[PDB]
Every structure is written in structure tokens, then in C-alpha cells.
């Protein structure tokens, strides 16, 4: 797979059911400690759903991060529109088996702010059926997604209305072949500089990735940064 082929696959997914964007504060950490061990316990990584026409914000507090554009085909542990908290894989359990089983099936704190229903605290959000959630009156907006193809359905109402949404949260296990592009903030010299460092590190291992600017439901190739 070459640079243009990754870009083409990325843009096809972006303009269909969407894909993943994973900003990182420490790209050398991500390269050496997350990406490289996958070639020869950071099994699950956080990422955000991006899609053409979905005005989705990325997690970048000071607007100076690079990151990875990751294929919609990465293994999905769970998706939560408002980032319902998860626990870390505990000692004695297999990381690769931890999600979706221990992924919260709804956002407890989110559903409670929405409805003020104190019955909500009577259940364990990781161990709850659709029928129980119906009985609790848990709104659909607070229920997690486990089938990637259905994330665009969860995000349809803001997308249709053209509204801005805060960073969404998926737990994925991404494989080297899932890495499709490098994220670049066009208004941040520090992001671009980190992006170049990351592109060089990845290229040296046989992964020549395009530079991708994502903002507000649109994504473009950057020739060079």
C-alpha cells in the first residue's frame, strides 16, 4: 500500500460511513510505544469518529497536536458519543477480551444529567440489556454503539442539523495496516512540525502516510508540511 492508495482509501471512508482520528500529545511515545510493538498492554486506543459533513471537534486543547487517521476497519471495542468513562484493563484479565464486555452500554452520568432519574444508579452500565435500558427510560442519545456502521446513525441528528459536537470517543485496537494518514492542524506550526517527525518515523518503517487536515466535517490532503 502506497501513500496515494492510503489517502484514497481514507477519503472513501470519510465520505461514506466515516472513520477514526486519534490525536496524540506525545507522538514519539505513540510511535515507539504504541505503534512499533504492534510490528514486533496498550491494546485499546481512544479515537474520535470523523465523517464528511459531521461537524466534529477533535481533542486538541492547545491546538498543537498531530495524530493518526485510522481506518474504519480497526477492531471496535465500543463507541460513546459523550465519552462515558471506562476502567483500565485490570491485572488478571486479557486486554483483547476486555471490551466490548466491560464497555459501558450507556453513559450513566450523561443519562442522569438528561433525565435526573435516580433509578439509573441501580444498575451497572457495563452489564445491562437493551430491555433494561428501555425500562430505565435511558434515551438513545446516551446508549453506546458497538457496530461501527451504526456510528453514523448515532451521529445523524447533529450531522443533519449541521451542529458542532464535542469530541466523541471510540475504543479501538488498530493494526499497522489500519494507519491511513497523519493529522495536521494547518494553523499550528508545532502540529506541522510534529507531523513531519511522525511522517519520517513511519516512512522509515515502510508506512508512507499522507498529511491530512481535518476540520468541521471536511478533510483535505496536504501536499507537504
Amino acid at each position: 500500500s502506497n501513500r496515494q492508495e492510503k489517502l484514497a482509501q481514507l477519503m472513501r471512508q470519510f465520505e461514506s460511513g466515516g472513520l477514526y482520528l486519534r490525536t496524540v500529545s506525545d507522538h514519539r511515545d505513540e510511535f515507539e510505544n504504541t505503534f512499533m510493538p504492534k510490528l514486533d498492554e496498550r491494546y485499546w486506543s481512544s479515537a474520535t469518529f470523523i465523517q464528511q459533513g459531521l461537524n466534529g471537534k477533535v481533542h486538541d486543547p492547545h491546538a498543537d497536536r498531530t495524530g493518526l487517521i485510522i481506518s474504519a476497519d480497526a477492531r471496535l471495542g465500543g463507541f460513546s458519543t459523550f465519552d462515558a468513562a471506562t476502567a483500565n484493563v485490570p491485572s488478571g484479565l486479557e486486554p483483547s477480551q476486555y471490551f466490548p464486555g466491560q464497555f459501558p452500554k450507556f453513559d450513566m452520568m450523561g443519562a442522569y444529567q438528561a433525565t435526573w432519574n435516580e433509578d439509573i444508579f441501580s444498575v451497572d452500565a457495563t452489564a445491562v440489556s437493551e430491555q433494561q435500558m428501555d425500562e430505565l427510560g435511558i434515551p438513545d442519545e446516551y446508549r453506546s454503539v458497538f457496530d461501527f456502521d451504526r456510528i453514523q446513525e448515532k451521529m445523524a441528528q447533529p450531522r443533519l442539523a449541521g451542529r458542532e459536537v464535542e469530541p466523541t470517543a471510540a475504543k479501538i485496537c488498530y493494526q499497522p495496516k489500519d494507519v491511513l494518514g497523519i493529522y495536521v492542524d494547518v494553523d499550528s506550526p508545532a502540529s506541522q512540525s510534529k507531523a513531519r517527525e511522525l511522517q519520517q518515523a513511519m516512512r522509515e518503517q515502510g508506512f508512507d502516510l499522507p498529511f491530512i487536515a481535518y476540520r468541521g466535517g471536511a478533510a483535505q490532503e496536504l501536499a507537504s508540511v
Binding site: 462515558a84 468513562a85 471506562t86 476502567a87 483500565n88 485490570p90 459501558p104 450507556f106 453513559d107 450513566m108 452520568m109 442522569y112 444529567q113 435516580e118 444508579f121 441501580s122 444498575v123 451497572d124 452500565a125 457495563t126
Partner: protein, 72 residues
């Protein structure tokens, strides 16, 4: 170790705890720092309300975990 309790008034409470501490103990520490009676505290971690008498370790509450306080 230190854990963080977020309230719905926008506060974040810092607590010094050992993993062998009980939820009761954690609620006592929230009384000590904020004058909240324990019987009025729900402690939420990763989508479940925590039971008095079980320990942080039993719920896998690690260093720098974030809990959510909700008043009863």
C-alpha cells in the same frame, strides 16, 4: 495515591487514598474536605454506583482515577 471527584457544580476534589480504603472511608474524606454527610453521597466510577464497604482495589480504582459525586 490521589483520586479526583468531580461534582455537578464544576468542582474537582483531590483526595489522598490508599487502594485498601473503603468507599465509606472515601466518603468520610469528602466529609472532611467539603462538609458533605456521607449518607448524601453517591460515588460513581465507570458506570456503576460504588458500595460502601468495598475497597478502591475491589473496584480497580487506580492512581489518578476520576470518580463522580452525585448528591442523594
Amino acid at each position: 495515591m490521589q483520586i479526583f471527584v468531580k461534582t455537578l457544580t464544576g468542582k474537582t476534589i483531590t483526595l489522598e487514598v490508599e487502594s485498601s480504603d473503603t468507599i465509606d472511608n472515601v466518603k468520610s474524606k469528602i466529609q472532611d474536605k467539603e462538609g458533605i454527610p456521607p449518607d448524601q453521597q453517591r460515588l460513581i466510577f465507570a458506570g456503576k454506583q460504588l458500595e460502601d464497604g468495598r475497597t478502591l482495589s475491589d473496584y480497580n480504582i487506580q492512581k489518578e482515577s476520576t470518580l463522580h459525586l452525585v448528591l442523594r
